[PDB]
Structure formats: C-alpha cells, structure tokens
C-alpha cells in the first residue's frame, strides 16, 4: 500500500552484540509495527474503509490488480506507537495486549537496523541469542512470542511497495496465512505468505515453548492451493520443546517450587549449536534467574529420547514429521545462516484457547481457562516486557 502523509515515529531500542573478549556492547535499533497493523484506508474521493481483512485477498473494487491496489490503498505512518501498546525505555520493549481504554492492539513488531530502512538481519547458526523477560502478566491462553521469520531484508521494497521495511512490510511465517498484501503488494489471487520460522520463545507464566518450523522454500514463498496446507511447503506444527510435554513438571511456573519462577523476571538463553561442517545440529535452551544459571531439563518420558537439546533424533521420535520432511535441523539452520528477521508479539486465540501451549500435555491450564473471555477476568491487561536483547558468541551473552 502507498505510504500516507502521517509520520512514522519508530520507538528506539538499544540491543547488544556480544563476544567473549569484549562482552556485550550496545547497538541502536528501531521497532516497527506490522504493515497491515498501520491504518489502511483508500485514496482521495474513494470513500471510507480499508483494503481487506486478515485471511482474504484485498477487495476487487479498489484492487482489481496490483498496480491499481498500489495507488488506491494508503498506509498511514504511526506517530505514537503507544496507541498500539508498543513502548520502549532504553533496552526494554513493552508490549501491551489490551490498553486501559479496552482496545486490544495485540501488537506484532520487527527489529529494524539503525537506518530504519532494512531489518536487522540475524545470522544465528553457531551463535546464541539471549533476552530478559517479565512474564508475570501472562496467564493461561496468552502467547508472548519472540521469533525469527525469513522475511526479505528491505521488506521487499519495490515500485509498488515504496514503504518497505520502514513501514513493516513483508511478513511471513510457517502458517502460510492469506493476507490482503504480501511483500507490500495487493495479494489479488489470495496466496498464502510462507517462510521458515524459528520460534525462539512462545510462552506465558504457565508454560514455555520453543519450536523450529521448516519450509522447503527459501525466503517468502507465495503458496497456492495445497502448497499452503499441512502436506505443503511449510511445517505448521514445528518441532515443539516444552518441559511439560516431556514429563518434567517442576521446571517452569508461578512460584518458588519451580526452577524458573515466573512471578519474577528471568533471562532466557538460546544456543544454535553447529556440527564441524557448519550446519545446525542442536538447539539448547537454558535460563538464568537471581544470578544463577538454571540448566535445561532433560526429557523424562518413556519413548522419548533422553536429551537436553532439540535435535533430529528428538524431533523424529516425537512425531514432528513435516519438520523432518521439509528440511530437518540442517534446513532450519540453513535459513538461520541466510539471515532472519526478529519478530515480537503478544496474542490470544479465540478458536482454540492456545491449548497447545499450556493445556494437557503442554501445561497446567484447565479446559476453558485460556479462552479470551476468561483471560480478561484473570488479568484484565496482559502484557510482556523484553529487555536487553543480545546475541553473539556462544557463552558470551550471560
Ligand atoms: O495465529 C496468529 C498469530 O501468529 C503469530 O505468529 C506465529 C506464527 O504464525 C507461527 O508459525 C509461529 O512462527 O509462531 C508465531 C508466534 O506465535 C503472530 O506473532 C501473531 O501476531 C498472530 O498473527
Ligand atoms: O493450533 C495451532 C498451533 O499448532 C502448534 O502445533 C501443535 C499442534 O497444534 C498439536 O497438534 C501438536 O500435538 O503439538 C504442536 C505443538 O508442539 C504450532 O506450534 C503453533 O505454531 C500453532 O500453529
Ligand atoms: C514421569 O515422570 C515421573 C517423575 O519423574 C516418573 O515417575 C514417571 O514414571 C514418568 N512417566 C513417564 C511416562 O515416563
């Protein structure tokens, strides 16, 4: 969509680059909301309304073709990100799901480089990524996410998409969702927006989940028909890693009886360990709280390989078939090596209550507990804060 007259005022966020020799050193980054979360309206004289809702192609009246859509649909800058629940303070990013006035912005943001015109590309195979988090205001059913997608570095800036990454264009993920614009272009044929996704963190105060999701396509692929489906180009389910799912119940939760006590802030470390020819072999998650390293649990479940790291053996044994078919750990690592964009969001699930995150095999949450209608009765204003985003040499971030 065509950028409007309203200014885009990106929140600034300080992050760090770390080495063993130099420690963690500060760097300036910026935060951008998803393009389609910006106000979208029509060109002068065309009346009120937008250019399509999530799940659909854009409307044919204004978007009969890409070229017309590019001129008839206007994407406004956001001059006050706090209106969308997004604020920063030094090295902290706060994402508010619900505002005091009852709006539910459910923000999704990407990390821009210091120029504001290219995403900060992270290349994490053989390195580690670490952050601090306050998860206290995330009950059952909430998903605070911090993850990587293989988006184009300028958001595919082009003739019909002059806005690019500066306006948050180019989103994709392993679900191949249909959005009315893809790569800043009207999605006239209603294709899905597919790409490799590494879910570093999907969590609330009750459960913590890690999952790589492979696709058999590089970068953003516009899928059609069965390509967008379960036996298509991307791994919808991922290879999930959650202590509950591997029969460890005392590792992560609200209270002193959990190794990681989500009533207080903590640090989350993720290492992407490569084999001697440079390909990803293992993904290792551990934590730090109150100045003490909390090593990963090991799996504790009959029929599940004994391990403290995500690898092909574990993924295959736990039924992650599409993960394996669409590239396995090596394929996930090849996407990581090519470069990925960092996305952070907070969201809830009206359909399915986020049961896969924190219910049943996945956590302590009861049936119905994660419904949005109940979430607001438990925590009226869910939010997450991510602090001191930092990445670099193995062993150097913590
Ligand atoms: O379900 C809608 C939300 O999707 C979130 O993205 C998911 C993504 O679809 C999935 O493949 C995986 O990579 O985990 C992501 C993080 O939970 C968005 O972040 C959120 O904004 C919603 O659109
Ligand atoms: O429900 C959408 C949700 O699915 C997750 O994958 C789940 C899957 O739903 C479930 O059948 C399986 O047993 O566990 C998986 C989690 O390990 C995806 O991970 C998530 O991204 C959503 O797409
Ligand atoms: C689950 O863990 C408990 C505690 O360690 C153990 O007693 C039990 O046998 C485990 N169950 C399975 C299916 O492995």
**Which CATH-level-2 architecture?**
Distorted Sandwich
Query: What is the CATH class designation?
Result: Mainly Beta
Q: Report the total helices.
A: 6
> What would the CATH topology be?
1,4-Beta-D-Glucan Cellobiohydrolase I, Chain A
Largest sheet: 15 strands, mixed
Bound ligands, each once = a molecule of 2 linked components (GLC-GAL), a molecule of 2 linked components (BGC-GAL), 2-acetamido-2-deoxy-beta-D-glucopyranose
Structural class: mainly beta
Distance between the termini: 42 Å
**Beta-strand share of residues:** 25-35%
- Count of individual beta strands: 25
Shape: globular
- Name the helicity range: 10-25%
Number of spatially distinct domains: 1
CATH superfamily: Glycoside hydrolase, family 7, domain
What is the radius of gyration? 20 Å
GO molecular function: cellulase activity
Subcellular location: Secreted
Modified residues (Pyrrolidone carboxylic acid): 1
EC number: 3.2.1.4
Give a structural overview:
GO terms for molecular function: cellulase activity. It is an enzyme of class 3 (hydrolase). It is built from six helices and 25 strands. With 398 residues, the protein is mainly beta. The chain has one domain (2-398): Distorted Sandwich (1,4-Beta-D-Glucan Cellobiohydrolase I, Chain A), CATH 2.70.100.10. The protein has a 15-stranded mixed beta sheet that branches. The protein is globular. The termini are far apart. 2-acetamido-2-deoxy-beta-D-glucopyranose binds at residues 247, 300-302. The site of 2-acetamido-2-deoxy-beta-D-glucopyranose has 4 residues, from loops.
